[PDB]
Symmetry: C3
Subunit: 140 residues, 3 copies
Amino acid sequence: TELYEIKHQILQTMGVLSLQGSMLSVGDKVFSTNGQSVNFDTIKEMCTRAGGNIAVPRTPEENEAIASIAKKYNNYVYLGMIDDQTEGDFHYLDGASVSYTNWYPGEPNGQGKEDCVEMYTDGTWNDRGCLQYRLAVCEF
Amino acid sequence: TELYEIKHQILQTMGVLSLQGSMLSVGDKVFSTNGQSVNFDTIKEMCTRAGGNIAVPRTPEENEAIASIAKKYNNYVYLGMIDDQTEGDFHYLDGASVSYTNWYPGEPNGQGKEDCVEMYTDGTWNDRGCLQYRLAVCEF
Amino acid sequence: TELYEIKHQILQTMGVLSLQGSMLSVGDKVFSTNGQSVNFDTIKEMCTRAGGNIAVPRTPEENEAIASIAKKYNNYVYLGMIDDQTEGDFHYLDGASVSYTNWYPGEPNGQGKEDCVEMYTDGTWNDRGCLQYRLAVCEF
Ligand SMILES: [Ca+2]
Ligand SMILES: [Ca+2]
Ligand SMILES: [Ca+2]
Ligand SMILES: [Ca+2]
Ligand SMILES: [Ca+2]
Ligand SMILES: [Ca+2]
Ligand SMILES: [Cl-]
Ligand SMILES: [Cl-]
Ligand SMILES: [Cl-]
């Protein structure tokens, strides 16, 4: 009965955090923002410090969840993808090539100097430099 | 030692949420509000979306907990009871007849068109229509 | 697989709370404040009500964590130590003699009527009366 209780209590705490607007759950992932806007490198640091990672959508469902955060907070969001070494070749921060995409029409159109990806409030993507201030969204 | 640790960490997270004023614990139940006022149907949706249910007190202790939220937020609260099909016969949303009551004197006095229950800041109840804006309180 | 899941979900909720700025984790301890300032006795009550205790640093790492809260909230903080019965002899609230100290130069200089300990925003300590208003920081 220790284990049933443990699960119930976890469900309660997650429920509270969800109600408060502090987390969104999509499958195995939890997304969260504290509402702050900073550049891409600072978002990475902020998420890592919290024990998570800069958010990236790998499915339509995850894109929709992150989009809803962009919408609720009315700001563009940096995503956990880059095209550093290879150009036009976006990779997650774990090194793996991106699969799911949701590019805004015409994108990625980027310079060799647009190594980051931002999400617009409508959930679509634009390759961009990494020094803009964007909503910090993390995944856990 | 995995299990002891797990319990400690749950206690910590619940402690934090409690300190922050984001949850109240009464026996097996956790109550929470995000401070928003909406109608009865929208409260149900909001609580369900968070993984919970619109709050209802089934004991004096639960009434007191929900009352304290009504007081802290200075608003009347819709409770998880209705008298839809039967009239004067209040039921929880699980279909079961209500046991514990805390009616304000003279109540329920309601029209066939007072199918919901609201709680006043003093913890007492009034049957009411369901289209008023009331503090959203959920249970998990 | 129930147990792995349970651990992941706990890590997620702690991550969210950390991101939100609602908790700091140092070893086995979690520190949190709701931002309120009250006297020493009221802090004890507030922390106990949440299921925790008034915070006290017992290591350099814990002092630094509590200092960062003092800094972020720009207020002095009461710590969980007193010199009630014995004078000049500080004890934790569990009765045990204090080990780690971080006194500001000249302190403790206190009257027999400075039975509490406050922390300055720079992390150093001053013995003080207990009736001042200080930032409430709890440990769990
Ligand atoms: Ca590029
Ligand atoms: Ca572009
Ligand atoms: Ca009625
Ligand atoms: Ca009535
Ligand atoms: Ca003294
Ligand atoms: Ca002093
Ligand atoms: Cl840029
Ligand atoms: Cl109405
Ligand atoms: Cl004083």
